[PDB]
RNA sequence: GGGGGAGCCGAAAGGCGAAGAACCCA
């Protein structure tokens, strides 16, 4: 499995809420291609990876790429939820915050909580 | 092959689409 660690539900919800709000004043990449490219460019502040992705090889490269680029990533249950959170009309396998907008402190705390796992 | 990244089809109702719509480059 590409899921490297278990993420508590409340942290997932905090993450998705944060992503929704970041959409208002920041910049977000949505979809595996954009996300991957943003990561490769050194731009990702935080990446989201749905846990219910099939086939897994769609997002299976992400954890390790994020590690090489020193990018914190979090897992969320469903691509449906992620899609709603990034504000598109279809499911979404992975995403990234590129610019935290006004949520600098909230994002920082979130990534610390992630590292805490 | 490399980008772009939410539109596209349709009279409407609908449908498709980040598991990638227009569009750009080769």
Curated annotation (Swiss-Prot):
The keyword Transcription regulation does not apply. Multifunctional RNA-binding protein that recognizes the K-turn motif in ribosomal RNA, the RNA component of RNase P, box H/ACA, box C/D and box C'/D' sRNAs. The keyword Phosphoprotein does not apply. The gene is rpl7ae. It comes from the Archaea. Gene3D superfamilies: 3.30.1330.30. Part of the 50S ribosomal subunit. Probably part of the RNase P complex. GO terms for cellular component: cytoplasm; ribonucleoprotein complex; ribosome. This is Large ribosomal subunit protein eL8. Belongs to the eukaryotic ribosomal protein eL8 family. One of its GO terms (molecular function) is structural constituent of ribosome. It is found in: Cytoplasm. One of its GO terms (biological process) is tRNA 5'-leader removal. Keywords: Cytoplasm, Ribonucleoprotein, Ribosomal protein, RNA-binding, rRNA-binding, tRNA processing. PANTHER family: RIBOSOMAL PROTEIN L7AE FAMILY MEMBER.
């Amino acid at each position: 499995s590409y899921v490297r660690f278990e993420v508590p539900e409340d942290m997932q919800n905090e993450a998705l809420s944060l992503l929704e709000k970041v959409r208002e004043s920041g910049k977000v990449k949505k979809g595996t291609n954009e996300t991957t490219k943003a990561v490769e460019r050194g731009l990702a502040k935080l990446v989201y990876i749905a846990e219910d992705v099939d086939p897994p090889e769609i997002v299976a490269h992400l954890p390790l790429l994020c590690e090489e680029k020193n990018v914190p990533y979090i897992y969320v249950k469903s691509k449906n939820d992620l899609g709603r959170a990034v504000g598109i009309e279809v499911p979404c396998a992975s995403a990234a915050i590129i610019n935290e907008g006004e949520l600098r402190k909230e994002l920082g705390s979130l990534v610390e909580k992630i590292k805490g796992l």
